[PDB]
């Protein structure tokens, strides 16, 4: 069971907190541009995720031109990051 | 009855095993405190860890001279420390102003700011003599909380 496996880890993690809790008795907007680019790149990663699991039944010649195409534009988005990104 | 007396020593053994000191670079004494890291005379991972940190550390070594400018500064560090706290006044300046003393700026005794448990008398406090300060601290922890 996956449900039994996950819940056992969290319940033991909660118990460790109580041990320390119960027993003893006596600005800058330049960071934002980095965070946004993380999200926009990971969505291109999300489109490029199926590649090892997808390419099994589909035609290779039709895929080859389209598979590289996403990575090329992923570099063009980084090419726009070279024309003055900032001090970061 | 017998289990009560033996379990108390086990908690005291935990502090006898490892003690994390504060790295105060406020002295010439602090260079001798860096000789505790120097391999020839070591308490490093024998008990001492040089990670320090203002909150996680159990021990704080007041290294040498303290001025009236640092008198409110060192006091707020002591409040951030956990309840099992031991203060070592390593150096003659820390004991009661080795030099200066009668001077306007230097605070006499350190105990006027922060209470001291272990005193180390040496100006250039030789690493050999500095090894006593930690070993005596481990020996001084004998009995805590009877009832």
């Amino acid at each position: 069971n996956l449900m039994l496996a996950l819940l056992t880890n969290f319940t033991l993690a909660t118990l460790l907190v109580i041990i320390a809790f119960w027993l003893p008795q006596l600005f800058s907007m330049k960071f934002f541009l980095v965070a946004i680019t993380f999200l926009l790149f990971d969505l291109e990663i999300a489109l490029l995720l199926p590649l090892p699991w997808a390419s099994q039944t589909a035609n290779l010649n039709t895929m080859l031109t389209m598979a590289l195409f996403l990575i090329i534009l992923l570099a063009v988005s980084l090419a726009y990051e070279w024309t003055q990104k900032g001090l970061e | 009855e017998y289990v009560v007396a033996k379990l108390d020593d086990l908690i005291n053994w935990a502090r006898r095993s490892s003690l994390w000191p504060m790295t105060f670079g406020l002295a010439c004494c602090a260079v001798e405190m860096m000789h505790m890291a120097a391999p020839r005379y070591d308490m490093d991972r024998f008990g001492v860890v040089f990670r320090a940190s203002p909150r996680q550390s159990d021990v704080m070594i007041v290294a040498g001279t303290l001025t009236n400018k640092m008198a409110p500064a060192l006091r707020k560090v002591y409040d951030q420390m956990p309840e099992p706290r031991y203060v070592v006044s390593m150096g003659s300046c820390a004991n009661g102003g080795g030099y200066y003393h009668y001077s306007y700026s230097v605070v006499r005794g350190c105990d006027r700011i922060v209470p001291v448990d272990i005193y180390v008398p040496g100006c250039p406090p030789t690493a050999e003599a500095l090894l006593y300060g930690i070993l005596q601290l481990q020996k001084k922890i004998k009995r805590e909380k009877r009832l």
């Binding site: 907007m29 934002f32 946004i36 999200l39 926009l40 969505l43 999300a46 489109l47 | -």
Partner: protein, 95 residues
């Protein structure tokens, strides 16, 4: 049928959440995520129970575009906090 009855009710709560505003502006973009989350469950179950194979890629594409509005509209939120002090629906100048 039975499972769809609860998530459609969950969709209406997220719909009202978009249409409701009290001081804070951040709730709307949080509700936009929830609306797309509720649509994601509804889309998946229809293709999973009634098999399609080809159409199972469509919610994966929907997953990508859900984040596009929840980032490019989310970027505009920070621009409000650059012009004004903090983000407020109460703080608007246009008539």
């Amino acid at each position: 049928s039975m499972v769809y009855m609860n998530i459609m009710m969950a969709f209406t709560v997220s719909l009202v959440g978009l249409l409701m505003y009290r001081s804070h502006l951040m709730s709307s973009l949080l509700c936009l995520e929830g609306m797309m989350l509720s649509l994601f469950v509804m889309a998946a179950l229809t293709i999973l129970n009634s098999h399609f194979t080809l159409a199972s890629m469509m919610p994966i594409i929907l997953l990508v575009f859900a984040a596009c509005e929840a980032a490019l509209g989310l970027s505009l939120l920070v621009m409000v906090s650059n012009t004004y002090g903090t983000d407020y629906v109460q703080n608007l100048n246009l008539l």
